[PDB]
Structure formats: C-alpha cells, structure tokens
C-alpha cells in the first residue's frame, strides 16, 4: 500500500512544523540547550523527508538562519563547503534566499547584518578579517546598501569607530529579529500538531 | 455551462515533457523499466498527436480513468513547439550521492526549457530526484531544491524521490503533478 508511504510525508510535514515553532521559542527566552536539542530533531527530520514543496523549503530556511545568528560571535565557526564564510556572512545569504513578507523590516534586518558582519571583526581587533568581510559583500563596482562609503573609511582608519556601530549595534540587530520571530510564531502557532496538542494540555 | 445543448471545446489529455541529466547518467534505465512494466498501461502514441519531428510520445494511466501522455527527450527549434503544447514540465535528477555537479549548467538547462514565451507560468516542474535502486546512497531532496535554486523559475514545483529499478515514488509524483493540471 504505496499510501503509506504518502501518509508518511503527511505526518512528517507537521513534524517540521512544530519543531520550526519549537526552535523560535527556545531562541526568542534565551534556553541554549534546549535550542541544541530541537536543532538536532529537526537535522534529522529533514534528513528523511522523501518530498519537497517551496512552503516546506521556507521553514528549513528559517531555522537554518537562527542557527547562524546564534553564533554570529563565534567568529570562527564555520558553516559553509567555503571556509571563508563568517557566520554573518552566512545568515545574510540564507535570509536572501527567503521570501519576503513584510518588506520593510526584511531590508532593516539586512542593512543591520551587513553592518554587523564587519563590526564583530573590527571589535576584537581583526583589521585584515573585516576587510576581507567588506571585499566579499560590496566588493563589486556597482549601487548596493549606501552604506558602502561610510563602511569603507571605518575600515581604512583601522581602529573600531565606535561612534556609528553604536547606532546599529548588535543588540539593535537582536530586537529586529526578535521582531520577526514573532511573527513567525503567530503563524505557525495555528499547524496540526500544536493545536491537537493543546486540547489534551486543556483537559 | 456556457452550453447546454452544443457540444464543448475539445480537451485532450494532459501531456509532459521529460528530460535531464538522470536519463543517461544512471546505472539502471528509468526509461526501460517504466515501458517495461504494468499498473501503468504504456502504449505508443497516436499518429494525430503527432509533433514534427518528434512524435507522439508515450501513453500511460494510473486506473483507466486517469490518463496522461509523455514526450521523451535525449537532448536539449523543434522542442519550443513542444514547450507550447505541453502542460507541465518533468526533470529528471541524479540523486546519487557520489556524483558532484555543475549546478550552474543544470538550472540553465532548465531556465530555458521553462520559459513563460512558451506558455502560462502557473504549469507545474516535478523534479524527479532519482538513483539505480534501493542499495545506493542518495543525496537528501532539500539540498537538491536549494543547490538548483527552484524559485527563481516561477513556476510552481515539488521534489519527489524516485528509484529506476522499483519506480518507488514515481506514482505519487505523478498523482501530483496531474492535479496542478486541474487546477487549470
């Protein structure tokens, strides 16, 4: 009866879903190992998915960038076949992979990335790093972010220029995502398995 | 309807164009076991339905009362009139897991196969993600959707796993794509 074989991409569509909601909580109050462990059920989970749609591929997107965000520090962790990639370096693709919803918080969030990704470097003192950073992401003789000059001679005078990474510093990059992640929660706390599972809580 | 005592513009069954890089590159021959085996009622094509060229395709079924036809293609003037008449486009992958690719090319191949010149852009692309059989390792389908970049296309897809020597999967991708067909 090949229709258990479609049963079981039913039953594991709504799997990924509630371990997606699952992660954007433990990342919204802050419970590390309780990140870790969702993290690890949901790499598996996708793993045995034997099918695919565009709504399936979006949810992997997002948790793959909270995975990244919560190492944007760790500067050399690495994440992708590229051993250059900075986990920055890293959420910034993965969040112009997903589709937009709200426009302009997408472009807030991607402005506040981008500046971040070389202020982490220049922070701990990695002047050659954050060049390299720089080269990567506007290294291209075109029109993108206008932030590009200004970056530009930050770097230059190697020295951290406190005085504008303190209006787009880290924790205002956190608050924006933190935004977002709300509502993602909104949404998905509507999917199959949360709500059934409630009624039982409920009794 | 519209009609109610003169008959109806005529609709002939949907047809599907298949192509890509896991009709050759396979140990075991996708095309050979489909022709060679049943539940699928495989019969050659009308000469009506005839396509310059090219022919009349292949003609299945799912329970006689589900009927479909498929224009296979070993390569790539004469397609384009394939890619007017068509309703839905079939990719055929090479899942197998030590095999390394040129992403580039593949979704150029696709790219231009798919274009909206041709025809609507709500026709759905079935990625078959295929390997010779059961024993062998297989790259997991999420890394396939993301390495082709499928949104760039437009067009509404879904990535099924399939196996050549069993046809494991091929029904419910089939199945599928057959109802982004009424949906038309």
């Given amino acids: ?203 | 309807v519209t009609s109610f005592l003169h008959s109806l513009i005529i609709q002939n069954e949907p047809r599907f164009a298949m192509f890509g890089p896991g009709l050759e590159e396979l140990n075991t021959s996708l095309v050979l076991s489909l022709m060679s085996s049943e539940e699928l009622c495989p019969t050659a094509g009308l000469p009506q339905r005839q396509i310059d060229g090219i022919g009349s395709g292949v003609n299945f079924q799912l329970n006689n009362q589900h009927k479909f036809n498929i224009l296979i293609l070993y390569s790539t003037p004469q397609i384009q009139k394939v890619c007017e008449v068509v309703d839905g486009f079939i990719y055929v992958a090479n899942a197998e897991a030590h095999k390394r690719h040129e992403w580039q090319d593949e979704f150029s191949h696709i790219m231009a196969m798919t274009d909206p010149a041709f025809g609507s852009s709500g026709r759905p692309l079935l990625v078959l993600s295929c390997i010779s059989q059961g024993d062998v390792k297989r790259m997991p389908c999420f890394y396939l959707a993301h390495e082709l970049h499928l949104n760039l296309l437009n067009h509404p897809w879904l990535v099924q796993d399939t196996e050549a020597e069993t046809l494991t999967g091929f029904l419910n991708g089939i199945e599928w794509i057959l109802e982004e067909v009424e949906s038309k």
């Avoid at chain 1, 919560?70 to 993965?94: C, H, V, Y």
């Avoid at chain 1, 929660?185 to 009624?199: G, R």
């Fill in chain 1, 1 to 203: 009866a090949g229709l258990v074989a479609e049963a079981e991409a039913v039953a594991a569509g709504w799997m990924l879903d509630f371990l997606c909601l699952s992660l954007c909580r433990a990342f919204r109050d802050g419970r590390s190992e309780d990140f870790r462990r969702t993290r690890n059920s949901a790499e598996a989970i996708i793993h045995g998915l034997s099918s695919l749609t565009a709504c399936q591929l979006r949810t992997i997107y997002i948790c793959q960038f909270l995975t990244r965000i919560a190492a944007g520090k760790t500067l050399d962790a690495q994440f992708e076949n590229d051993e250059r990639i900075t986990p920055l370096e890293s959420a910034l693709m993965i969040w112009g992979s997903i589709e937009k919803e709200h426009d302009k918080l997408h472009e807030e969030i991607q402005n506040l990335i981008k500046i971040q990704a070389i202020a982490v470097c220049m922070e701990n003192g990695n002047f050659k790093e954050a060049e390299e950073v720089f080269e990567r992401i506007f290294g291209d003789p075109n029109s993108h972010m206008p932030f590009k000059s200004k970056l530009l001679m930050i770097i230059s005078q190697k020295d951290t220029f406190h005085s504008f990474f303190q209006h787009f510093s880290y924790n205002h990059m956190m608050e924006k995502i933190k935004s977002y992640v709300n509502y993602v929660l909104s949404e998905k706390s509507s999917t199959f398995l949360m709500k059934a599972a409630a009624k039982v809580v409920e009794s």
